[PDB]
């Protein structure tokens, strides 16, 4: 019982994320003492 119309995508996932969804800081390391580039203290 749902109107036949266009479907935005051919599937649906309720829990699509395992191992954590990608954010920009997944694939880069950290810095000793937690320092930004070109910073003394």
């Amino acid at each position: 019982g749902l109107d036949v119309i266009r479907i935005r995508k051919p599937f649906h996932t309720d829990n699509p994320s395992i191992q954590g969804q990608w954010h920009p800081f997944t694939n880069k390391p950290t810095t000793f003492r937690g320092l930004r580039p070109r910073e003394v203290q």
Binding site: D14, N15, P24, F25, T30, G34, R36
Partner: protein, 55 residues
Amino acid sequence: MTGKELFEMWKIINPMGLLVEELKKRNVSAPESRLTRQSGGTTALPLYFVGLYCD
């Protein structure tokens, strides 16, 4: 229930307060919040990756 996670229907107040309360039941020390990564701090879109460490 599969769709909605915990804190969508079961809203809570003072989560870190409840956290420290639960951790004392589990017999561990009081954790400290520390920003691990940062981006756009002075920008109008601040972004911080805060982690809670104990021992």
